[PDB]
Design a protein around this ligand. Structure first.
Ligand code: SQD
Ligand code: SQD
Lengths: 443, 82, 149, 499, 146, 134
């Protein structure tokens, strides 16, 4: 269908609310903060449209089509030009569905959650801004213009981590959770500039062609094209939580629970995996990187696995579990069969967002019995045994954690089984490690 | 135009165009000649720079006035003279 | 002036100037589990907040409110620029000669003259605002002459 | 056209401020309005001259004129605007009007003060619009006394030491500039010599190019802080009133870059082309050294001063690495820093004077009493972090692109220097958020009493918003400040001779 | 003396609607053995991950069996250690034996004394960046000051 | 500071619109990495007169120069790396294009409205044919 030249309104769809609240939140602080719950409706509705404008954009791709892209020159000066615009390929629609669905759901869950709080409107503004930035990142034509959104989602995650900005730990975790992905985007920018010098272009349609086939022989650049790509891989690592850079997710889970469920299934996985999956056409000419990706995957996998043990904080053990799960995606990408890695990511997104929301509900349910205190709540050793008291929020936790463990009828099973098969088919060297972690997680 | 790239692993084709504000870079500066409206938001009341909890108007006056200590030593000398 | 002294020097990078998060004397009692619902609507709240400046009062408001809808329309049904930059020019002059012809308030003047014995009133109000150039009360030679009744 | 604009644009502020003297009217009130009206009139005349009396399509000089002034050493009223000048002229008018507004509640003297403000205004525009080298020098040193008076009358605890160090240091730095003036003035004075336009064709002999180049470069490194010549900045910034410091660290610094662009790269190519790589190296190491010493400071005013120091490495590296965009990205950088540094110093001076605590360790949780300051402070901190969207990003990006595509480099330092430059992005947030966290986050004592703690009123908030909006407007679509077609002739001279 | 009663009426609707997702999504790549149905023309055996680029297998059967075997083994040890006893899935006969003749309790506990000591130390790599990086730059700033 | 190795595009008074000082990354000598960048650059000057065809064409002579210098250099690098037979007609093609570019630049430098489009019609007709002879 021709429903593409109007698709550019997707990443800009919720924006007409954000600027219409922040202004009110800055100029007239005592009026907009009195239309408290009403402000939820114009947002959850608007973003909703995006979702129904995405399935029809994705169903087409399912029926078989050709991807489009639109480029516009936003600089014409002396001796070069700069472009912007987006593209709609299978992966774009996949991540689009996966972001807008969890977004429209976590918005309602937040309306339920943050109802006694004070920063209601500011919270909604932050959520909508992060959402309209992520929706922008996933649909982006040339490298420079994805870098323009990478750091935006980084800043959004920063502002969301230290949300309450008054708990003296949430003031010491946001800084780290910013500096880590700052190192990541540093590596990303260096790799971008390297590939630019090497190939002379910025867009994929030309980069994938030039870098693969035509390049001079060992004028030293070979070492550069081995090095520069490692920097892009380092950025994609740091936005996710792999071995060398994982120290920001466990403590970053200090923020509010809905944000803890949106920065562990919506951005933590997307900005990490998605970029590597899109740049895969490049890495097939660099077997070294194909091996190093698999190695860091099967390192961070086992490391995240063996740290969920004995961690008696639910909103912390969940983060360790989701890092150990992203290990599996990082491994699966390192063997070519990403067609199952994306499926595993789609399953794990929901299978973890459900658990985070359930944990938030359990905390707020038991929080009146023990004092209003983290580590006095959310510490499941003085909690324990709630099947009798809150059933409707218990069956969901069970049927999510079993799916995550791996059972045929449920989800998150047909994906990790396929990727374990492919791992064993590659080599036992870390196939055995994958097989062992597949049981440690079930534990 | 609408060039149709048959890439070696997928099903691309693209369409691009060049745009740039022709000369409205003058009109936007003329509109941003709204700093001549910086007079309604200056005649408004001052928050506390006119409040009774303020006396001394320099950049270090109120902070480093702070030499009534000398005057107090002098008052001590005078009281001793009394 | 007593200015008591100091004590066992604190961490150079003290994490957040705050009470260490042990005696943080409520978790969730300082920021979140706090709100109720009281009152006060929207419009009678807005038009009770644009008037804690008395920003203009009279004519000085008409020439300040009807100006933006005349310099946003100007970029349509276009009129030459010369007309547009004398319009904003005669504004910045008319609005100025009405401001500087408003009365004076005690906070406007010097610090050493701000603090009188509450005779500042009949020294400034109705005393300054009732003459043009008289300098009978020219006490800006500070040695505390005070030259007034 | 022959109706002189630039002459009016230079002699309007100081003249119409000379009437503040000999005007016995009040203590403080009427002078504020009489000064802000003149400032707004000047800015409006500036934008009227720019809009309908400029072309953006020809690299010559516009609105030029000259006279006869001293006639012994040929020195005229020669005056003319050009592409490079225009951006800085507009930025000067804008930020100085807004600084004069930010100086609203000053009643200490309030008569010498606004007059000195107008004098600095006229001097800045005179320099930025100059066309005769000696007149450029005159306008350069004319402002040296007003700034000293503004320092020594208002601002900071130890105002005196800062003021005297600043004045002595700058006056000494200008000596090498005057040396260069005497050097290239006497070089065939029959050929005009002192007409900055007719010097493009001068062919000086060797071993003299270098001496004049260095005589100008030393003065510039004095004005624009370069590593071994930066010790003066923290004292003359941490002690200045925020009203002064806005225009000081937003305009007066950028003169050291505008002059270096105008009289070095345009007049002495084979004295600058054999000295560009060391400029690039110095800027590259400065970008990291300034930040690594900023993180160490403990009073946030000096931290902001050092953050202003750091961004002056992008300008350097853009002046070297001779390309169209590298030189062109420098101009966008000086604009996007004249915005950000000025606003950040205004915010620092506005948060202070409310808390009376300068050391960053005792600053409690100021977010509870005053939210709007916290918001507009975090926003501009993000801007200074080179965050995308805001204009602090595209400048550095174009600087990178200029270095990368440079012709006077072959891939060995073209990568290591890029690496050491990108370390700045890892380093800057470490010291910006370390301040944002100590001074704003955390819950201090129950600072409920609404006394000596009031959020920004209408004036300060409007100043913040009116400076902020251009940042977004430029960072979203940065062709409002790429109206520069002189570089297509500025970088035309250099581009083929040896080496 | 209070009790953990249910939460509000708004934090359950998304939980339920997403539970509806965590079971159906498995039908995207459902299987590779005739799909699963001869009717149901809604993309039965053409598994819906066709957006991607451009009996059952005995080997895959045995691989999935090994996978679910390790899964149920982990679940079983978890239920042995943490699970309750009032149910019927903790036989407790063996439990009544693997405390009576526990041979290696003198050694096993030390393993405990290791493993927990690790996880509480947060995977020591965290402390590494503390005692190296944020204590390296803290001295580097002092050096470049002096 | 860059030279040419097939001097037949330089017409009388050998020069052109070209704006030296543009960085063109190394692609290797081959009649596959030049006939591709020449295409994907000659694709832009089709999209040129889409928006910036009218409406103050003062940037057109700032982008045509740019995205035609690429063609001017890569086409020489190409016409070198070709067999003897295909060189005469490819050169003939080169001649008609790099003359229409000079004509278009000289016409647009006059700030006209209909002359610009009438001239652009010819460079479009020829430039749509360049994307096929490759
Ligand atoms: C194209 C590129 C664009 C890039 C744009 C980048 C913008 C970056 C903006 C960064 C803002 C950082 C704000 C930090 C939190 C803060 O200061 O809040 C304190 C105050 C008031 O919060 C008040 O706080 C109150 C709680 S309390 O009373 O303070 O405890 C509560 O009522 C509520 O939160 C609110 O009223 O500031 C705001 O919340 C204004 C929020 C504006 C957010 C806009 C996001 C877009
Ligand atoms: C596969 C093999 C892998 C081998 C290892 C590879 C590791 C690569 C990444 C290095 C680890 C990065 C962890 C970042 C953690 C963090 O952000 O801490 C947060 C702290 C916060 O600072 C502090 O923050 C404090 C608050 S708090 O303590 O953080 O809460 C604050 O109080 C204090 O003032 C402030 O200083 O950040 C720092 O102190 C330093 C930041 C890290 C600086 C890194 C510079 C770039 C390194 C490149 C290395 C290249 C190696 C190869 C060279 C050829």
């Amino acid at each position: 269908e021709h429903t593409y030249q109007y698709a550019w309104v997707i990443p800009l769809l919720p924006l007409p609310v954000i600027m219409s609240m922040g202004f009110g939140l800055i100029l007239i602080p005592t009026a907009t903060k009195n239309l408290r719950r009403i402000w939820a409706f114009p947002s959850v509705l608007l973003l909703s449209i995006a979702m129904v404008f995405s399935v029809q954009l994705s169903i087409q791709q399912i029926n078989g089509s050709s991807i489009y892209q639109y480029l516009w020159s936003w600089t014409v000066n002396n001796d070069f030009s700069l472009e912007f615009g987006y593209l709609i390929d299978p992966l774009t629609s996949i991540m689009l569905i996966l972001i807008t669905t969890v977004g429209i759901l976590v918005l309602i869950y937040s309306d339920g959650y943050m109802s006694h709080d004070e920063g209601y409107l500011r919270f909604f503004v932050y959520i909508s801004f992060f959402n309209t930035s992520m929706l922008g990142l996933v649909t982006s034509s040339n490298l420079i213009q994805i870098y323009f959104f990478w750091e935006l989602v980084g800043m959004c995650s920063y502002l969301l981590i230290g949300f309450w900005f008054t708990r003296p730990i949430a003031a010491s975790a946001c800084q780290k959770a910013f500096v880590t992905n700052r190192v990541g985007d540093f590596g990303l920018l260096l790799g971008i500039l390297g590939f630019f010098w090497i190939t002379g272009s910025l867009e994929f349609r030309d980069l994938f062609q030039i870098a693969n086939n035509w390049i001079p022989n060992n004028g030293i650049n070979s070492l550069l094209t081995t090095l520069c790509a490692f920097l892009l891989f380092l950025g994609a690592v740091a936005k996710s939580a792999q071995f060398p850079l994982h120290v920001w997710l466990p403590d970053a889970m200090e923020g509010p629970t809905p944000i803890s469920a949106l920065i562990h299934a919506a951005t933590m996985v997307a900005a990490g995996i998605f970029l590597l999956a899109r740049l895969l056409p490049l890495f097939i000419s660099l077997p070294l990187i194909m091996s190093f990706i698999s190695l860091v995957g099967t390192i961070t996998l086992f490391l995240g696995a063996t740290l969920a043990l004995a961690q008696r904080d639910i909103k912390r053990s969940l983060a360790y579990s989701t890092m150990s799960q992203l290990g599996y995606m990082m491994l699966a990408l390192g063997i070519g069969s990403y067609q199952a890695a994306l499926f595993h990511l789609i399953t794990h997104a929901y299978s973890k967002a459900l658990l985070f929301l359930g944990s938030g509900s359990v905390i707020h349910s038991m929080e009146p019995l023990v004092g209003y205190s983290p580590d006095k709540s959310q510490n499941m050793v003085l909690m324990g045994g709630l099947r009798k008291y809150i059933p409707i929020t218990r069956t969901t936790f069970l049927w999510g954690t079993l799916s995550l463990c791996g059972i045929p009828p449920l989800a998150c099973f047909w994906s990790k089984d396929e990727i374990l098969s492919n791992s064993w088919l590659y080599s036992p060297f870390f196939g055995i490690i994958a097989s062992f972690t597949a049981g440690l997680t079930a534990f | 135009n609408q060039r149709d790239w048959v890439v070696t692993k997928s099903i691309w084709h693209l369409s691009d165009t060049a745009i740039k504000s022709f000369y409205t870079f003058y009109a936007m500066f003329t509109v941003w000649g709204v700093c001549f409206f910086a007079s309604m938001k200056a005649s408004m009341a001052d928050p506390f720079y006119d409040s009774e909890h303020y006396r001394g108007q320099g950049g270090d006056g109120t902070v480093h006035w702070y030499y009534d200590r000398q005057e107090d030593i002098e008052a001590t000398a005078r009281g001793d003279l009394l | 002036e007593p200015d008591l002294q100091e004590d066992p020097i604190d961490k150079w990078r003290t994490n957040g100037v705050s009470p260490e998060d042990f005696v943080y004397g409520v978790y969730d009692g300082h920021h979140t589990y706090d709100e109720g619902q009281e009152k006060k609507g929207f419009w009678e709240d807005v038009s009770e907040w644009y008037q804690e400046a008395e920003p203009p009062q009279g004519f000085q408001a008409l020439i300040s409110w009807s100006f933006p809808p005349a310099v946003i329309l100007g970029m349509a049904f276009d009129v030459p620029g010369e007309y547009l930059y004398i319009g904003a020019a005669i504004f910045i002059v008319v609005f100025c000669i009405i401001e500087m012809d408003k009365p004076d308030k005690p906070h406007n003047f010097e610090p050493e003259i701000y603090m009188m014995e509450r005779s500042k009133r009949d020294k400034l109000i109705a005393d300054y605002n009732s003459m043009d150039i008289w300098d009978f009360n020219e006490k800006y030679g500070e040695l505390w002459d005070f030259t007034v009744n | 056209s022959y109706f002189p604009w630039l002459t009016i644009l230079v002699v309007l502020p100081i003249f119409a401020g000379s009437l503040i003297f000999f005007l016995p009217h009040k203590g403080n009130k009427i002078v504020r309005w009489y000064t802000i009206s003149i400032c707004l009139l000047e800015f409006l005349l500036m934008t009227y001259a720019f809009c309908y009396h400029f072309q953006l399509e020809d690299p010559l000089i516009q609105l030029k004129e000259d006279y006869k002034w001293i006639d012994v050493f040929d020195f005229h009223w020669r005056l003319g605007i050009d592409g490079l000048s225009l951006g800085s002229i507009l930025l000067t008018g804008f930020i100085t009007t807004l600084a004069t507004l930010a100086a609203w509640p000053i009643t200490r003297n309030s008569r010498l003060f606004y007059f000195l403000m107008l004098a600095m205004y006229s001097g800045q525009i005179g320099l930025f619009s100059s066309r005769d080298l000696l007149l450029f020098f005159i306008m350069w040193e004319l402002e040296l006394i007003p700034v000293y008076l503004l320092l020594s009358m208002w601002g900071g605890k130890r105002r005196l030491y800062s003021a005297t160090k600043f004045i002595l240091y700058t006056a000494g730095g200008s000596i090498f500039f005057l040396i260069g003036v005497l050097g290239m003035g006497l070089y065939g004075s029959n050929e005009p010599g002192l007409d900055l336009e007719r010097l493009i064709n001068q062919s000086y002999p060797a071993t003299l190019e270098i001496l004049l180049y260095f005589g100008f470069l030393i003065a510039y490194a004095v004005k624009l802080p370069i590593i071994p010549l930066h010790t003066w900045l923290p004292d003359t910034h941490g002690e200045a009133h925020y009203s002064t410091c806005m225009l000081l660290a937003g305009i007066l610094l950028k003169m050291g870059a505008y002059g270096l662009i105008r009289i070095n790269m345009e007049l002495l190519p084979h004295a600058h082309y054999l000295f560009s790589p060391w400029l690039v190296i110095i800027g590259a190491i400065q970008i990291i050294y300034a930040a690594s010493t900023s993180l160490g400071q403990r009073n946030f005013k000096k931290r902001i001063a050092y953050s202003s120091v750091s961004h002056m490495g992008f300008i350097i590296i853009g002046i070297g690495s001779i390309t169209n965009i590298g030189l062109n990205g420098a101009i966008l950088q000086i604009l996007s820093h004249g915005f950000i540094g000025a606003t950040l110093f205004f915010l620092a001076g506005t948060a202070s004077d409310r808390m009376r605590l300068v050391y960053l360790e005792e600053l409690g949780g100021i977010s509870i009493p005053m939210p709007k300051i916290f918001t507009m402070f975090s926003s501009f901190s993000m801007a200074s972090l080179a965050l995308p969207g805001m204009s602090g990003f595209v400048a550095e990006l174009v600087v990178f692109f200029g270095l990368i595509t440079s012709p006077k480099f072959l891939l060995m330092p073209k990568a290591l220097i890029t690496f050491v430059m990108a370390i700045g992005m890892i380093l800057t947030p470490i010291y910006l958020l370390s301040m944002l966290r100590q001074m704003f986050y955390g819950y201090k004592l129950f600072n409920v009493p609404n006394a000596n703690f009031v959020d920004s009123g209408p004036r300060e908030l409007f100043i913040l918003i009116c400076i902020f909006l251009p940042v977004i407007g430029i960072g979203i679509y940065p062709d409002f400040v790429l109206s520069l077609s002189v570089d297509r002739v500025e970088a035309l001279l250099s581009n083929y001779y040896p080496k | 003396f209070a009790y953990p009663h249910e939460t509000g009426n708004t934090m359950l609707f998304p939980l339920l609607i997403l539970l509806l997702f965590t079971l159906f999504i498995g039908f995207i790549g459902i299987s590779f053995d005739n799909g699963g149905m001869d009717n149901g023309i809604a993309e039965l055996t053409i598994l819906s991950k066709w957006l991607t680029p451009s009996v059952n297998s005995y080997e895959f059967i045995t691989n999935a069996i090994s996978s679910v075997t390790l899964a149920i083994f982990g679940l079983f040890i978890a239920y042995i250690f943490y699970g309750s006893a009032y149910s019927f899935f903790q036989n407790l006969d063996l439990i009544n034996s693997f405390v009576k003749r526990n041979p290696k309790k003198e050694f096993l506990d030390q393993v405990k004394k290791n493993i927990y000591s690790w996880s509480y130390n947060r995977g020591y790599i965290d402390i590494f960046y503390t005692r190296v990086f944020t204590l390296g730059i803290r001295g580097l700033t002092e050096l470049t000051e002096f | 500071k860059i030279r040419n190795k097939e001097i037949n595009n330089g017409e009388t008074g050998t020069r052109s619109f070209v704006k030296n000082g543009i960085y063109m990354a190394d692609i290797g000598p081959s009649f596959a990495a030049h006939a591709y960048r020449v295409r994907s650059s000659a694709f832009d000057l089709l999209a040129l007169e889409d928006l910036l065809g009218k409406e103050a064409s003062n940037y057109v002579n700032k982008y045509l120069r740019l995205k035609a210098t690429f063609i001017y250099y890569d086409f020489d690098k190409l016409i070198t790396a070709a067999d003897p037979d295909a060189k005469p007609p490819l050169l003939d093609l080169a001649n008609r294009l790099f003359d229409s570019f000079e004509k278009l630049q000289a016409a647009v430098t006059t700030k006209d409205d209909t002359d610009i489009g009438s001239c652009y019609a010819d460079t479009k007709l020829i430039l749509q044919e360049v994307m096929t002879r490759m």
